[PDB]
């Protein structure tokens, strides 16, 4: 209608390359590093405080 | 002595069909030529996108 801009189009192989390239940013390494940091911080805190 | 009736009728019929085919073809060509520019505009908008 009016300006010929369709709402959506069928996927193309060239579009399929970009669809395959697109991915969620992976935070598994960041989460593992954050978990290791907090765990080591808790371990350090266990004996850090004066008795 | 007069113009050949079979030939004149055949020539008139073929001229009429050729003229109508030419008219529909030119109308379609004008329509597609007019419609082509919005596609160029959409390509420019897509390149901006």
UniProtKB/Swiss-Prot annotation, chain A:
Component of the Smc5-Smc6 complex which consists of KRE29, NSE1, NSE2/MMS21, NSE3, NSE4, NSE5, SMC5 and SMC6. The chain holds residues 4 to 54 of 267 of the full protein. Belongs to the NSE2 family. This is E3 SUMO-protein ligase MMS21. It comes from the Eukaryota. The lineage of its organism: Eukaryota, Fungi, Dikarya, Ascomycota, Saccharomycotina. It is found in: Nucleus; Cytoplasm. Acts as an E3 ligase mediating SUMO/Smt3 attachment to SMC5 and YKU70. Acts in a DNA repair pathway for removal of UV-induced DNA damage that is distinct from classical nucleotide excision repair and in repair of ionizing radiation damage. Functions in homologous recombination repair of DNA double strand breaks and in recovery of stalled replication forks. Present with 2800 molecules/cell in log phase SD medium.
From Swiss-Prot, chain B:
It is found in: Nucleus; Chromosome. Sumoylated by MMS21. The flexible hinge domain, which separates the large intramolecular coiled coil regions, allows the heterotypic interaction with the corresponding domain of smc6, forming a V-shaped heterodimer. Present with 892 molecules/cell in log phase SD medium. Acts in a DNA repair pathway for removal of UV-induced DNA damage that is distinct from classical nucleotide excision repair and in repair of ionizing radiation damage. Functions in homologous recombination repair of DNA double strand breaks and in recovery of stalled replication forks. Belongs to the SMC family. SMC5 subfamily. Component of the Smc5-Smc6 complex which consists of KRE29, MMS21, NSE1, NSE3, NSE4, NSE5, SMC5 and SMC6. This is Structural maintenance of chromosomes protein 5.
């Amino acid at each position: 209608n009016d300006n010929p801009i369709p709402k959506s189009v069928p996927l193309h192989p060239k579009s399929g390359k970009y669809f395959h390239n697109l991915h969620a940013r992976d935070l598994s390494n960041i989460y593992q590093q954050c978990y290791k940091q907090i765990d080591e911080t808790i371990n350090q805190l266990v004996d850090s405080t004066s008795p | 002595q007069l113009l050949p009736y079979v030939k004149v009728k055949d020539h008139k019929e073929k001229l009429n069909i050729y003229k109508e085919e030419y008219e529909r073809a030119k109308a379609n060509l004008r329509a597609i030529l007019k419609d082509k520019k919005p596609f160029a505009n959409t390509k420019k908008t897509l390149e901006n996108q």
